[PDB]
Design a protein around this ligand. Structure first.
Ligand SMILES: Nc1ncnc2c1ncn2[C@@H]1O[C@H](COP(=O)(O)OP(=O)(O)NP(=O)(O)O)[C@@H](O)[C@H]1O
Ligand SMILES: [Mg+2]
Lengths: 323, 69, 193, 96
């Protein structure tokens, strides 16, 4: 009954949405945009099935790009410490097998068996990868199915399977050469390519550069953490679990607005005299839907307002407008 | 591979708007919450399938299998 | 296997970037986040690495900074707390006194390591310094100084850990300004690059 | 089947019905329809057997429904199996 009162106070406190973001990653100072995205990932979009059987992805995939001195790994260790059904591994010192699934001999039966990789343990959950850019291309091309079709399909050793991989992926990435350079595109700052970058919903580019007031505040926070937030973890998780029971619907006024705001991203992404796309594929339209659904969950409303579309549109612009 | 399909993601405003409208309409038409109760929602489902499909998929699969065999 | 103790690594400058990429999560998380066929584990390994490294080629170039000499990238050097140059350059004063220092070994019949390692062990069992405000003020200030010398919070965290280590001397058990000053000062010897 | 087939528009109604929630891409849907109905296998006097199957390659950009088209056919065909990239092996693909 007192937990029910906590949920009632949460929905009564109608600017809760800000308190949630500030409750994310409490050991990390600043980086409000990342914290917001992490909240929306943990809330997720809504999983859907079409009349033709085609599934449409619910999970939100995020990549956090920045210098190795940055707070990036502490974001991963926060989610790994906080989120149910979550796993942690490094891009180097892991293998495509240990990622999706392996095929091995059973010590009991002697014949072959499937052996579960991390993207199976993270099914209906989250997968957190450190040093993702330093992963072999052998293994980056392996997770392509799990990120989008949300399955691991296998045909090896006479054993055939299609195992579920409904995971939200969170990737800590370094730019090329380790140091970010905003004079280049996000295309140029990463060793990735469009097949994998289009599979990520949104990129947060947490570069580090000096600013004396921010630096004094950050230093004070770091030193105060060595002991010279709006919710407890239980309260935050209880709200997230409650919020995951909503299944928001696109209000009709949000639909046409979403079409136009996608068309603005679609226009501004275009490259060359051909007007070829690079970052805005159809996956990013679906990303706007998933993010607006996650926002509607963050607000505990079963309907998506056009404001939520605007927030998703702005969150996708973060990875583009730094031309 | 004795047919090749080449697929390109060109930015094109009147194609992208129809595509994006279709994708959004398809998403809500696939949303979970959207002659007894079980049969009634199947009839609504049938009309939803007829919103986009000139013949039912259930009919098409048997038609394929028949035509093949 | 060096969990909870010093890992000495020689020839460190010749090591491949892949192996350094594994040591990244040692220096950042002190654990190994494995995932391979049948084996998934966060293998805890809390080792204080003591690397020994060289400039590329036969000699250090004194007309270049340590990064341009060592050829390992700057943020890898920023993982470590202190980085040192020890150089073979000719000087008859230093070379005489070193030769004397070395040749004195054959004359004679806290020095001993048994007492040193005992003292370090007893300090680890008994001395766990908390931080005073006189340390906080210099920590925040000194980092903001070298940040606009151009530095990162990893230097500040290094200063904190070094000041706590300095505060284990004299069984002091409390960090104060002087501990931060020496931690900062020794870092000023290093961060000049 | 007999009744609906004699409609002179049946081919395009089938091709539109292919992967119906996938907008456009009518040449893909045509190729998928052709593959999924197939040709006729033959053997001249028992001497010379000829492939009846039609093989189709979908080559193109990210986020253009190519994988979803395959996932549609996986639901639609009588006998079918789906394999991806490094999830396959040579023996796992042909026989072992
Ligand atoms: N014309 C379309 N109609 C409907 N959905 C589409 C269309 N084009 C792309 N999509 C969506 O795009 C998403 C990804 O589709 P997918 O099948 O992975 O495309 P793809 O061409 O195979 N990309 P890739 O795996 O990188 O080669 C799906 O969730 C689809 O719903
Ligand atoms: Mg594909």
């Amino acid at each position: 009954s007192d937990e029910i009162n906590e949920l009632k106070e949460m929905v009564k406190d109608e600017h809760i949405y800000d308190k949630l973001v500030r409750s994310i990653a409490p050991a990390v100072f600043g980086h409000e945009a990342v914290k917001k995205g992490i909240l929306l990932q943990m809330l997720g979009g809504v999983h859907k099935s079409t009349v033709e059987g085609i599934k449409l992805r619910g999970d939100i995939n995020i990549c956090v790009v920045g210098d190795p001195s940055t707070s990036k790994s502490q974001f991963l260790k926060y989610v790994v410490g906080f989120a149910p059904r979550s796993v942690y591994t490094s891009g180097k010192a892991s293998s495509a097998a240990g990622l999706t699934a392996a095929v091995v001999r059973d010590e009991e039966g002697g014949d072959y068996t499937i052996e579960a990789g991390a993207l199976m343990l993270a099914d209906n959950g989250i997968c957190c990868i450190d040093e993702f850019d330093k992963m072999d291309i052998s293994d980056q091309v392996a997770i392509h199915e799990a990120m989008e079709q949300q399955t691991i399909s296998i045909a090896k050793a006479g054993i055939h399977a299609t195992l579920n991989a409904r995971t939200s992926i969170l990737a800590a990435a370094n730019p090329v050469g380790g140091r970010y350079n905003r004079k280049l595109s996000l295309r140029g700052n990463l060793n990735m390519t469009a097949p994998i970058m289009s599979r990520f919903d949104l990129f947060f580019v947490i570069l580090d550069d000096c600013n004396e007031k921010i630096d004094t505040e950050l230093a004070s926070h770091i030193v105060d953490l060595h002991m010279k937030p709006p919710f407890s973890a239980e309260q935050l998780r209880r709200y997230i679990k409650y919020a995951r029971t909503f299944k928001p619907i696109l209000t009709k006024e949000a639909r046409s607005y979403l079409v136009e705001k996608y068309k603005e991203l679609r226009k501004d992404d275009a490259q060359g005299f051909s007007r070829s796309s690079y970052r805005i594929t159809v996956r990013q339209l679906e990303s706007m839907i998933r993010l607006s659904e996650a926002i509607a969950r963050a607000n505990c409303v079963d309907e998506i307002t056009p404001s939520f579309i605007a927030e998703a549109y702005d969150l996708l612009r973060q990875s583009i407008i730094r031309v | 591979f004795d047919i090749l399909c080449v697929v390109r993601d060109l930015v094109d405003e009147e194609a992208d708007e129809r595509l994006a409208t279709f994708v959004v309409d398809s998403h809500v038409r696939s949303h979970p919450e959207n002659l007894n109760a079980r049969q009634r929602r199947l009839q609504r489902q049938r009309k939803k399938e007829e919103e986009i499909s000139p013949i039912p998929q259930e009919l098409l699969m048997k038609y394929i299998h028949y035509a093949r065999t | 296997l060096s969990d909870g103790g010093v890992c000495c690594i020689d020839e460190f400058d010749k090591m491949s970037d892949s192996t350094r990429s594994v040591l990244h999560e040692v220096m950042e998380q002190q654990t190994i986040s494995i995932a391979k066929a049948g084996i998934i584990t966060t293998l805890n390994a809390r080792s204080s690495i003591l690397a020994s490294a060289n400039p590329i080629g036969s000699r250090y170039n004194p007309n270049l900074p340590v990064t341009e000499n060592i050829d390992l990238p700057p943020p890898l050097l920023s993982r470590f707390d202190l980085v040192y140059l020890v150089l073979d350059k000719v000087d008859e004063k230093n070379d005489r006194e070193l030769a004397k220092h070395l040749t004195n070994l054959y004359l004679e019949d806290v020095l001993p390591v048994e007492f040193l390692t005992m003292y370090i062990s007893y300090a680890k069992e008994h001395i766990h310094p908390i931080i005073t405000e006189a340390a906080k003020t210099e920590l925040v200030r000194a980092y903001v100084g070298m940040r606009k010398m151009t530095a990162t919070t990893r230097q500040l965290e290094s200063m904190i850990r070094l000041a706590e280590a300095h505060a284990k001397m004299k069984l002091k058990n409390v960090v104060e300004l002087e501990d931060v000053q020496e931690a900062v000062r020794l870092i000023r010897s290093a961060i000049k690059d | 089947f007999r009744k609906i087939s004699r409609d002179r528009g049946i081919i395009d109604k089938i091709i539109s019905s292919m992967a119906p929630s996938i907008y456009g891409h009518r040449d893909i849907k045509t190729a998928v329809a052709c593959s999924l109905f197939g040709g006729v296998p033959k053997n001249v006097n028992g001497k010379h057997s000829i492939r009846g199957d039609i093989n189709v390659l979908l080559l193109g950009d990210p986020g253009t429904a190519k994988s979803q088209i395959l996932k549609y056919v996986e639901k639609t065909a009588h006998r079918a199996v789906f394999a991806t990239g490094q999830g396959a092996s040579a023996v796992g693909l042909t026989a072992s």
